[PDB]
Design an enzyme around this catalytic site. Structure first.
Site, PDB file in Angstrom:
ATOM      1  N   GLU A 175       0.828  -1.204   0.000  1.00  0.00           N
ATOM      2  CA  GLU A 175       0.000   0.000   0.000  1.00  0.00           C
ATOM      3  C   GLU A 175       0.866   1.259   0.000  1.00  0.00           C
ATOM      4  O   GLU A 175       0.866   2.060   0.935  1.00  0.00           O
ATOM      5  CB  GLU A 175      -0.967  -0.020   1.185  1.00  0.00           C
ATOM      6  N   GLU A 177      -4.063 -10.635   0.850  1.00  0.00           N
ATOM      7  CA  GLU A 177      -4.785 -10.482   2.107  1.00  0.00           C
ATOM      8  C   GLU A 177      -6.255 -10.769   1.837  1.00  0.00           C
ATOM      9  O   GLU A 177      -6.820 -10.223   0.886  1.00  0.00           O
ATOM     10  CB  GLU A 177      -4.618  -9.070   2.684  1.00  0.00           C
TER      11      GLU A 177
END
Ligand SMILES: OC[C@H]1O[C@@H](O)[C@H](O)[C@@H](O)[C@H]1O
Ligand SMILES: OC[C@H]1O[C@@H](O)[C@H](O)[C@@H](O)[C@H]1O
Ligand SMILES: OC[C@H]1O[C@@H](O)[C@H](O)[C@@H](O)[C@H]1O
Ligand SMILES: OC[C@H]1O[C@@H](O)[C@H](O)[C@@H](O)[C@H]1O
Lengths: 989, 989
Positions: A420, A496
């Site tokens: 991210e 994830e």
């Protein structure tokens, strides 16, 4: 313009865009025979609130120390009373104005004295395996350099500075630096020297770096070996030896080994090796395996593999970022014990000792660089370091050090650029660098969905629906045809998924079925392995975990840190017990007639020779049959039908109908392994003969009438309310309908999509489901049988300020032995509130009893909790537990502990026992109320009040993963509806 | 089907759609010479939780009382320990399913014994002036009937049931009934017999009802009198006498009185009267006045009037719905003392004694029926009783009883059907009934904007903008042309406006200017007169008010009850002090040259003869001149220029420039009145000679330098931070920028319109304005004058996780006596957060000092607080107060106490005194921090910490009325911007 500010020079250094200065080239972490001394131990330490008041006294020389106390090293110094932990998710704890740092910036001065013997000369170095986040290092007053990259290794040459005998090493550590802007991982902020500090000699004619290249030709079975070795960046002469394979060769040359046993997580074959020159020898473990992408699939050794993975942070409840080695070995064995085969090092390189354990026990590893700029997203990514050219060198360095340290370990099958951090030119530079240095491992990065500079398509928390579209290769196209072409040929991985926060995760099975059906899908890594709980000790010795905000921080994200499959002390959550079952490598489908079972080998390489297949028939009393059946080994990705002994089918055939019985087939380890003992369970399957419908009692007992009470056998009712006050001598303080439960962590999050942005907990609160009120409509006794009577109590349940409601009718009946209870629910009005349809948590009943309960027994699913979209790990059988062990010790208390699929139950209250039977229901028993549970923020806030709260649910809603990702799937939702369910009670002393 | 429920008969009665049964016809409350006995006193009382367990023993007869204790009557029985108050705004406290009632329904049994003498025979009655909400009445065991309509009178005939000597009266009272569905006013739910209980004889040849008709012909000055009188519903013979007018006439006949003095709120002329027959005589007070609507204006006695009104609930902090008479007289005098002239009895008829006081003191009254079904709105008005035909009779009854009781009082100029009850056929029936019965008073109802069945157009909380459109008669049209035509010819009134909750109300002046400009606008009634605070006494004798939720209720609306111009004990809030000034009936514009002033008479009827006009010149030292000037009386709605004595203009002309001086002209009462003593202030105006710009000190003192400190005259700085630590010996523990204040009640509400639905407090919290952080950029000493130096400290202020900020530069200078301080603010970046532009509460500085402050003095506006859109009542002058009296005792602590328009200030800390001067700033001084203030929910949560928090603001934001109605108006908003302000400090011992 006179300049009068203090510490302006130290601050400029902390604001530097550059990598650390004065350090040796990045290289591998290598087991060498060179002399070494670990400086770990008891150091001396001093803390200042900021750079401007950090004393510039003579502390680096070690004489006349003022204000230092003892501190262990390595350490996360907030774990030892110096400051406090602070946890933030996305948000930075400081103003976002790179490269500047705040004025409140803890400065940690570290110092140790050590002895340097003759064997550390003429050349030597000091090695630091981790400093968060900015370190300056002096040796005997002389500056060596600085460190940048908190989970990366740095080495400093001390030739001509290390003196023989006593030396003094000094390190100044700043919590916040310009590097904090690129280390925004969701976790506790913990400054300190948190990894090994080691003194190592570098004899002449030694070895500085090694690069193993051990491939596998799956057609021929050959091994392709080439071990590189270098000194001062230069390739050198050195000899390689692998005894087991009858090999002695020169470094730098590629050879074909005629036959090797390949390495895989399932079979982690490792050949011992040594690379040696005149002055130094290096011990290696070599796993032969080749990684390749073809036909849009991720393949090792010529076979598509399925990743059964978790995301592994490094955390310890009492020592922070320091994870003892005994704890590492433990949790990795625990992982294997739960059928995990893959690990993602979220979101930074782990301790260098992790890599060898991963090679030995067997995991497919995604090794991830230390880089995350998540906190820049809220501002449209403006000033994002990932696209700021001034940060290029500093970010390439992070990737370089990441790759060099661990490039020799077969368990690493992917390099990951970070997490991210948006998109930008620096990320592309990191990718170009890695592809050139090591083209034997594909590159991973989720932040750029275009996937321009990666080899696998990665996403996080994509819905089951989108995952299925991708599995079929028909996701929407990118605007650039050339990039769309590339990505459609890439395999897909969920780095994830199934967020495991609190009660849950739900919807695991649905993902898994897609993984097994579509080759392009590589699998997924659960978020996350552990809760980052921090132990807080209170008066009377009570111990509980703290989370975000519990340490007095101004900015935090609460209980998002406790989002793990296990707690900080590695005790399984129910989600791990379910995860293990979902990802089980063998599928066992037991036949209904108990003649045999179908066995599918889900592994990718190994057959079924490691397993012993065992069966057992259990019934009311005890076990009736059991044994072991021999199975001709089954190849990977094939199946066979295994016959069971005829004696088993005969028991089933001669079973007096209505008697419950359970046939369970298990696949256990035939012999000890490195990660579990023989008999450890790996896969299982069952066939159940259900108990017949419960016989409703004969209504042959009439209703006695008094002024303020009714009685119907062992039951006493209140004339005013119409509700039981006794059953067989047991005080019933209340009975009523339930439509609500104490919100889970998932219920506290938004389900994006639809015009309703309220979390489910808020929808419930606005609707009044948590504060239901009941009005009595009528009480009536009706003709039963041979004198007896039924008793129908009619009620309407609703809530203040609402017009919608439900009509609930309770019809009681008895023969003297067992009480029968029918419950009918009918919705009255339109269940809409603030313009959106209300949903229910449950359709059930709450029994409140005046006695405490010691023990709970039931026939159904167990031992652990089960909700409609969970409980895969709960199996059919007979269970019995003390009351306290029916609960679940989540850090923030919430709804939990329900037992779905129950057919019968038994509560022991003192000397008596209350039995419940009926069609399948869910069972929950607690020593406290639902409101006390919803209010509690930590475990200590739970207090037993002498009562027993019993919950019998006819319908339940799912739990989902709405805390991050999909909410409850359509089929597990619970809209308001009519319902009807029967139930029998009985009390025996 | 046997039926076994308890209390089913009592519940059916509570569920009745009908009015009470067995009662005498509705009539006026009349002062009669008939014998009467007040049964008020010490009664006996018993409480049950519901109807089903309410004992049916022999309690009504008075013998063998089991479980009764003493209780006063009248009473609100939760005020005396029986249950507890519960406050809800819109929402019902029970399930919305009319006509049904909940099971938790307090039942109050009341009983008293009294003696009936011979003079109460043969005929008599019992009168109950208020029972909330459903009463059943027995006399000596015989049932008389039931009561419905909680604030309405009921009378029961006891002929042949009242026995001579001792009698026993019994009353069963239920809190909740079907009537609760139509009594959903925003206030405390308080069951009980809360108004007078009286025994009255009805001799033969008496008078039961009277209807006064006293009109006024404003052309001729004649009075038009007709007094009706009836017995048993029949018109009877009776003689009317008004001594003062030389009149004796028969009831039922209309006469022209040649000359009367008309009645008005300004001049409430009342002629004493008596209506008498053989057996009975009635004492009346008669006010001659005619009400009419013409040219879209509301006119009394031929003149358009301006309503200066408030909404009056009935409430007392210790007795609930029981308001002692001494408290009534007090608050109504207090109203007049603050220039109020109108009252709306929100939302029910008041105590019958209220009416006479309103006639005497003089208020235009909107008498409102007891009806509100607000709680049905959330469900689209489904099941609304106002349109359910089954409720017609019950609602007509409420209006009948409302009109009959008070139809004789000249102060009632409008009948109101109720409040927020939607639209429906029953409301139309109530209107048709009233127009037929009494066509001399226009009808009011806001709930139907179409205005089909009313005579005035009423709205609540319409913006200043829409009010101005209506004032010009160009609001949007209704779809029905016929109804649009009617409404456009109707005058307009705001039955509720400028919501006075907490700090505020803001924007009063803007409304008022529209009232004075547009005749169609009738004026407005502030919401509301009083806070409904309930006193709670705690250990150590600390007393504070409680609000919604503080009494353990499951459903509540918090602190919305404390939304008043005065507190529950009638102590003015700052809003009342401002309201008084805004609505002042005379306007005084003092000339700049102090030669005279313009005087406009804003009254509608009276001239200026009641007032004495006085002037006073005040200056630094004391007063320099003063006296009284005679003014030839000025007619209503005209103006004149009054000359002042030449001595005043001479003082102004010979004033050494820069010396501050204030000329104040006041209009006080020349003689005592019924509502205030002579000298009471009614209107005022001022002209100010400002002090000249403050001389900036000569920068002739240099900067001493040390290791960790700087010093510049009397100031000591910290080298690390750059901020003062001392000034003249006074410890400065902190200094910094402020952009935030503890949210007001208005800041906690939504501003509907625009895509941002967050309250201003949430916008601030999301943006980080409450947790600002400062980074030091540079410290620099610069060349001053003749050796001296300036000191510029450069900082940047921002907040965690945000990219926007401000650059703040502090430049200090000194000559040794006085410290000069320049502050420059420059915004850095775009101040947007979550997609919306951030707004500021202020641009100022917070000084935190280590000493406590005893006294605060200042030249500016006072004595009370003032914010940009408030403070109308604060006048120019010199003020001095102890610290504790600078605060404001709002029930929920919040931002308050700022003094805008300050030119100088002085704080006494022990023996020293800190002086601040500069261009206009706002001043606030508190003994606690802003975070402590924001956290506190009640006054006790405020604790002094030994420090002094001083706030100096260069700019401030308005307060508005966003809690209900318009937010801050455009011109008072505060967007982020650059700013610069100078300021001088000084310390003297
Ligand atoms: O082949 C069976 C094994 O596969 C591994 O990948 C897994 O980690 C082990 O727990 C076990 O299930
Ligand atoms: O640059 C960051 C963005 O990258 C895109 O590829 C993605 O769709 C967005 O959700 C966001 O993550
Ligand atoms: O005419 C002057 C008076 O007008 C009344 O309406 C008002 O209530 C009084 O307070 C006073 O202002
Ligand atoms: O029936 C109730 C409604 O009446 C309308 O006239 C009004 O515009 C609405 O806001 C609502 O009050």
């Amino acid at each position: 313009g006179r300049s009068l500010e203090l510490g302006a020079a130290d601050i400029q250094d902390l604001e530097s865009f550059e990598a650390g200065r004065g350090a040796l080239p990045a290289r591998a972490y290598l087991q060498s025979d060179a002399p070494r001394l670990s400086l770990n131990g008891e150091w001396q330490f001093r803390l200042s609130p900021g750079s401007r008041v950090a004393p510039d006294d003579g502390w680096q020389l070690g004489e006349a120390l003022n204000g230092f106390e003892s501190l262990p090293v390595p350490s996360s110094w907030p774990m030892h009373g110096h400051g406090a932990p602070a946890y933030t998710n996305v948000q930075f704890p400081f103003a976002v104005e790179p490269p500047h740092v705040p004025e409140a910036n803890p400065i940690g001065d570290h110092l140790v004295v050590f002895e340097a013997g003759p064997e550390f000369f003429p050349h030597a170095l000091l090695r630091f395996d981790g400093i968060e986040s900015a370190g300056t290092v002096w040796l005997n007053g002389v500056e060596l350099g600085t460190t940048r990259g908190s989970r990366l290794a740095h080495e400093f040459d001390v030739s001509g500075i290390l003196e023989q005998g006593e030396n003094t090493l000094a390190v100044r550590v700043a919590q916040f630096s310009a590097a904090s802007y690129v280390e925004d991982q969701a976790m506790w902020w913990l400054p300190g020297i948190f990894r090994d500090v080691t003194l190592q000699a570098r004899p002449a004619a030694g070895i500085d770096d090694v690069f193993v290249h051990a491939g596998y030709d799956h057609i021929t079975g050959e091994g392709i070996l080439k071990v590189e070795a270098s000194r001062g960046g230069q390739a050198i002469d050195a000899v390689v030896r692998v005894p087991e394979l009858a090999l002695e060769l020169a470094a730098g040359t590629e050879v074909r080994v005629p036959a090797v046993e390949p390495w895989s997580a399932e079979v982690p074959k490792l050949y011992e090796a040594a690379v040696s020159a005149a002055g130094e020898s290096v011990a290696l473990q070599i796993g032969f395996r080749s990684i390749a992408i073809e036909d849009a699939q991720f393949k090792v050794n010529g076979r598509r593999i399925l990743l059964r993975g978790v995301n592994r942070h490094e955390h310890h409840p009492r020592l922070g970022r320091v994870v003892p080695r005994d704890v590492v070995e433990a949790e990795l064995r625990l992982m294997k014990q739960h059928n995990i085969n893959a690990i993602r090092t979220s979101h930074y390189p782990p301790h260098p000792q992790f890599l060898a354990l991963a090679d030995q026990l067997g995991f497919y590893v995604v090794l991830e660089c230390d880089l995350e700029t998540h906190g820049f997203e809220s501002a449209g990514w403006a000033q994002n370091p990932s696209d700021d050219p001034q940060w290029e060198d500093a970010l390439v360095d992070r990737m370089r050090r990441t790759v060099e340290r661990d490039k020799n370990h077969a368990s690493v099958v992917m390099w990951s650029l970070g997490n991210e951090a948006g998109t930008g030119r620096n990320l592309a530079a990191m990718s170009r660098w890695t592809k050139d240095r090591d083209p034997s491992r594909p590159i991973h990065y989720e932040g750029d969905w275009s996937s321009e500079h990666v080899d696998v398509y990665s996403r996080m928390y994509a819905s089951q629906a989108e995952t299925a579209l991708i599995g079929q290769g028909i996701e929407p196209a990118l605007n650039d045809a050339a990039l769309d072409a590339r990505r459609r040929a890439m395999p897909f991985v969920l780095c994830e998924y199934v967020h495991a926060m609190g009660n849950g995760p739900g919807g695991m099975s649905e993902y898994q079925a897609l993984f097994e059906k579509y080759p392009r899908l590589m699998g997924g890594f659960v978020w996350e392995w552990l809760e980052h709980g921090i132990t807080v000790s209170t008066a009377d010795g009570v111990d509980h975990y703290g989370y975000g905000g519990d340490f007095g921080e101004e900015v935090h994200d609460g209980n998002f840190v406790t989002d793990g499959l296990v707690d900080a002390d590695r005790r399984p959550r129910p989600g791990l017990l379910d995860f293990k079952k979902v990802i089980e490598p063998l599928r066992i489908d037991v036949a209904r007639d108990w003649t045999g079972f179908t066995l599918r080998n889900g592994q990718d390489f190994a057959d079924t020779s490691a397993f012993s297949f065992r069966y057992e028939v259990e019934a009311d009393g005890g076990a009736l049959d059991g044994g072991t059946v021999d199975v001709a080994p089954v190849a990977p990705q094939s199946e066979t039908v295994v016959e069971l002994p005829g004696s088993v089918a005969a028991l089933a055939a001669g079973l007096s109908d209505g008697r419950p019985a359970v046939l369970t087939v298990r696949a256990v380890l035939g012999a000890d392994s490195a990660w579990a003992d023989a008999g450890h369970e790996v896969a299982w399957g069952q066939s159940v003969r259900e108990p017949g419908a419960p016989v409703p009692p004969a209504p042959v007992e009439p209703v006695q009438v008094q002024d303020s009470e009714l009685t119907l056998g062992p039951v006493v009712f209140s004339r005013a309310t119409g509700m039981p006050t006794s059953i067989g001598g047991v005080p019933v303080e209340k009975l009523g309908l339930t439509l609500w439960w104490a919100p889970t962590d998932n219920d506290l999050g938004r389900e994006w999509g639809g015009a309703d942005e309220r979390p489910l907990a808020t929808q419930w609160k606005d609707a009044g489901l948590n504060r239901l009120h009941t009005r009595l409509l009528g009480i009536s006794a009706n003709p039963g049988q041979d004198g007896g009577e039924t008793l129908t109590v009619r009620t309407r349940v609703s809530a203040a300020d609402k017009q919608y409601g439900v009509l609930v009718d309770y019809t009681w009946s008895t023969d003297g032995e067992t009480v029968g209870l029918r419950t009918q629910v009918r919705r009255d009005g339109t269940w809409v509130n603030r313009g959106f349809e209300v949903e229910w948590a449950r359709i059930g009943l709450e029994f409140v009893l005046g006695e405490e309960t010691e023990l709970v027994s039931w026939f159904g699913q167990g031992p652990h909790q089960s909700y409609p979209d969970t409980g895969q790990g709960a199996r059919a059988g007979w269970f019995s537990l003390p009351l306290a062990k029916m609960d679940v010790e989540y850090v923030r208390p919430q709804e939990c502990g329900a037992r779905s699929g129950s057919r019968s139950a038994a509560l022991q209250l003192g000397g008596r026992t209350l039995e419940i039977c009926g069609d399948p229901f869910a069972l929950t028993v607690r020593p406290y109320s639902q409101d006390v549970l919803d209010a509690a923020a930590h475990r200590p806030d739970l207090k037993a009040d002498g009562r027993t709260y019993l919950y019998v649910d006819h319908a339940l809603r799912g739990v989902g993963t709405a805390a991050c990702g999909p909410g409850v799937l359509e089929q597990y939702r619970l809209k308001p509806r009519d319902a009807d369910f029967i139930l029998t009670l009985k009390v025996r002393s």
